[PDB]
Amino acid sequence: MNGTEGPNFYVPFSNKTGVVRSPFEAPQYYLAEPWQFSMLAAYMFLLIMLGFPINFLTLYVTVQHKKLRTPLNYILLNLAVADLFMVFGGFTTTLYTSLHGYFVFGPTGCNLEGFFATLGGEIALWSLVVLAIERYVVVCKPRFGENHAIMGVAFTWVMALACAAPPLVGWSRYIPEGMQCSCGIDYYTPHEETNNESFVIYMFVVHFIIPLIVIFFCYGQLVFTQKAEKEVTRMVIIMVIAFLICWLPYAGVAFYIFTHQGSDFGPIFMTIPAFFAKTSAVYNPVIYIMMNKQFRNCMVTTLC
Amino acid sequence: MNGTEGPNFYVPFSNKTGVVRSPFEAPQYYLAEPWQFSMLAAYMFLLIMLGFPINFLTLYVTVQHKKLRTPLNYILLNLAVADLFMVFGGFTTTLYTSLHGYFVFGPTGCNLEGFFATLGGEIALWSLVVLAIERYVVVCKPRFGENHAIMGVAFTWVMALACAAPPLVGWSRYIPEGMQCSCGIDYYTPHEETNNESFVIYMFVVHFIIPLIVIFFCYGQLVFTQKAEKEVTRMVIIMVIAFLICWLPYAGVAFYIFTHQGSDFGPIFMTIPAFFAKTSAVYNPVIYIMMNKQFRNCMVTTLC
Numbered sequence A, B: 001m002n003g004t005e006g007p008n009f010y011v012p013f014s015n016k017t018g019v020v021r022s023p024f025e026a027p028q029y030y031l032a033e034p035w036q037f038s039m040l041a042a043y044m045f046l047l048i049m050l051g052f053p054i055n056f057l058t059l060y061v062t063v064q065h066k067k068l069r070t071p072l073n074y075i076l077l078n079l080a081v082a083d084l085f086m087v088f089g090g091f092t093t094t095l096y097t098s099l100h101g102y103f104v105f106g107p108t109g110c111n112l113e114g115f116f117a118t119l120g121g122e123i124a125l126w127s128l129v130v131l132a133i134e135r136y137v138v139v140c141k142p143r144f145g146e147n148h149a150i151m152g153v154a155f156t157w158v159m160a161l162a163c164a165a166p167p168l169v170g171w172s173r174y175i176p177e178g179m180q181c182s183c184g185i186d187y188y189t190p191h192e193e194t195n196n197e198s199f200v201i202y203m204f205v206v207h208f209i210i211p212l213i214v215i216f217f218c219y220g221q222l223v224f225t226q227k228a229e230k231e232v233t234r235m236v237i238i239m240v241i242a243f244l245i246c247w248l249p250y251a252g253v254a255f256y257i258f259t260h261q262g263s264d265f266g267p268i269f270m271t272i273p274a275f276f277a278k279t280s281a282v283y284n285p286v287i288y289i290m291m292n293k294q295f296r297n298c299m300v301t302t303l304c
């Protein structure tokens, strides 16, 4: 083992020189210089200050305008709510932690940071499953109305909770990653008390691979077989591409670590993909404004 | 108005073509195909056949083992009893009604179905209030013993009856919902003879908002402030999450209808949430077996 395992942490740094301290006890300056922690804090402050207004505006515009009741409108409203939980429930702890160089709030802080990021990302992924099904129904006509959209919304919360909640209560656990200022699922240690190995296989099969199979099955039908529907289909394509850009680096590094436990990697290895993935709280409403004329017009109408 | 109001019903279907009939007089096949009603009957048959043994077994094991006398054990015993009232007092009417496509038993059958489901759901909510307070006292030490647990049990019946009983005797009323095979509180009509509007405000304030405020106050004190106690605290978290998944869709759709009476919704709109919420009779013992090692071992000992 090239790192330092403690009771509830795995630091990617050798303790041969005796300098490692728990990320719940002391700033982690032995593994990165203070200016690097400051860069994480500046980044998180930007995400909060952009993320709160843009998601709140999306929520407000949608509720105000009764014409915005297609399945796409409902799904984007649901994403705005999930994004606001990411920002206030998790990112406020990411910022405080990065400011101090360690999880001042202890494991409770780590649970908040990991839980709300996992929940938000999985609501986004299962939302893309709902939209892929909706597009496949509408275009291929093998009708998806408001009732189906609302049922789809409730479905995304149930699937997302089935991924994000077990590590709070004894199946796997949330543990600090990278420079130790964010938390994720424990890919690092076997920790039989929490049955870590079976949770990770469950997560990658049920909450990554199966959703992507459905999305690409639906897309294969669309491709390998009016103007308003085209606009929606084009936007969903970009939402799926943006999701893969956002999360594939994190998913690949996580799976690498899981299959190479204790190997020689350092704190920067997981820091960059883990913090890049937090853009997930901001980008979907940006796509929305650029790619949906009706929503953009309503937003301009309300804001002006 | 987009639906059809009668003396004691509100059918979410227009009578502009003359086909609407009272759900106490004739099968409701004008608003849904016979196979849809058959899915409701099959679902209810499953809930009864699972619901009776799993709740009876929980009751039996608890009474047979004198070691199971913590506040959690008393509260789960109370839920098992309330669940059995839901299954035999209410769901037997849901099943018979769904088989025939209307309330063969008339308003009396509607009262049974609505009363026992409301009672069972409110016993669960007020039980979570009791557990939240017990966790707050136990963990934050601001002692919750056996006398307090039993007092809490009696309290949950009194509060639940203060919600479920008035619509039997002239404050609001039970009325069929959705495909007309379950009954709920009258969100649909003003019906001033039974003072409908004031009851709905009373129900949502006293019997939804106030309990939730207490639970999240206690949880917040938990978060911003041993192994055996941790297991109990984790189970209570999952009981609260499961309750919200089960009941929030129903509460949301009911409040939407109350504030948009006569609006253009169909029979499927309330059917799905109202029938999904009936899983409330089954799911708590399943959590118990999965998340309490002492109870699980006692059950295996009893069963084998």
Ligand SMILES: *[C@@H]1O[C@H](CO)[C@@H](O[C@@H]2O[C@H](CO)[C@@H](O)[C@H](O)[C@H]2NC(C)=O)[C@H](O)[C@H]1NC(C)=O
Pocket: A004, A006, A015, A017, A018, A019, A020, A021, A022
């Ligand atoms: C890294 O190694 C150091 C040196 O062995 C550990 O610090 C010692 O910890 C023991 C047990 O807590 C104490 O009795 C010693 O006094 C400590 N020595 C010094 C110099 O502090 C340290 O705990 C290790 N870090 C981790 C995370 O395990």
Ligand SMILES: *[C@@H]1O[C@H](CO)[C@@H](O[C@@H]2O[C@H](CO)[C@@H](O)[C@H](O)[C@H]2NC(C)=O)[C@H](O)[C@H]1NC(C)=O
Pocket: B004, B006, B015, B017, B018, B019, B020, B021, B022
């Ligand atoms: C829906 O409209 C039909 C047609 O008007 C109603 O049926 C009539 O009801 C009156 C009053 O009972 C009878 O005198 C007529 O003979 C009925 N006509 C037919 C063709 O059956 C029906 O009652 C309405 N449904 C509801 C629930 O109000």
Ligand SMILES: CCCCCCCC/C=C/CCCCCCCC(=O)OC[C@H](O)CO
Pocket: A241, A244, A245, A248, A249, A252, A253, A256, A264, A265, A266, A269
């Ligand atoms: C469709 C658009 C997609 C756009 C996005 C494409 C992302 C491509 C990269 C993925 C990360 C894969 C991570 C694999 C990690 C292997 C690392 C490794 O072997 O490194 C050993 C070393 O010891 C470590 O410090």
Ligand SMILES: CCCCCCCC/C=C/CCCCCCCC(=O)OC[C@H](O)CO
Pocket: A146, A147, A150, A153, A154, A157, A158, B241, B244, B245, B248, B249, B252, B253, B256, B263, B264, B265, B266, B269
């Ligand atoms: C903590 C975990 C929670 C998980 C569970 C989350 C549930 C989300 C569902 C909300 C239903 C709200 C209903 C709102 C009704 C809107 C109605 C509407 O706008 O359309 C009416 C139309 O007539 C239709 O046919």
Ligand SMILES: *C/C=C(C)/C=C\C=C(C)\C=C\C1=C(C)CCCC1(C)C
Pocket: A113, A114, A117, A118, A120, A121, A122, A125, A182, A183, A184, A185, A203, A204, A207, A208, A247, A250, A251, A254, A274, A275, A277, A278
């Ligand atoms: C900054 C904090 C983060 C990234 C914490 C946790 C994130 C996860 C456990 C992500 C899981 C995944 C998602 C959301 C979707 C793609 C695949 C996945 C299972 C790795």
Ligand SMILES: *C/C=C(C)/C=C\C=C(C)\C=C\C1=C(C)CCCC1(C)C
Pocket: B113, B114, B117, B118, B120, B121, B122, B125, B182, B183, B184, B185, B203, B204, B207, B208, B247, B250, B251, B254, B274, B275, B277, B278
């Ligand atoms: C299948 C039959 C049903 C769902 C009948 C009635 C249910 C209610 C009137 C439920 C009320 C509520 C409960 C129990 C808890 C959440 C809030 C609530 C007031 C909507």
Ligand SMILES: *[C@@H]1O[C@H](CO)[C@@H](O)[C@H](O)[C@H]1NC(C)=O
Pocket: A001, A002, A260, A261, A262, A263, A264
């Ligand atoms: C630690 O790193 C060395 C060098 O890369 C490697 O040979 C060794 O296998 C690693 N330890 C583990 C447990 O993988």
Ligand SMILES: *[C@@H]1O[C@H](CO)[C@@H](O)[C@H](O)[C@H]1NC(C)=O
Pocket: B001, B002, B260, B261, B262, B263, B264
């Ligand atoms: C019935 O539905 C139409 C179309 O949505 C709406 O304009 C009308 O206001 C509704 N009636 C009521 C009483 O809400």
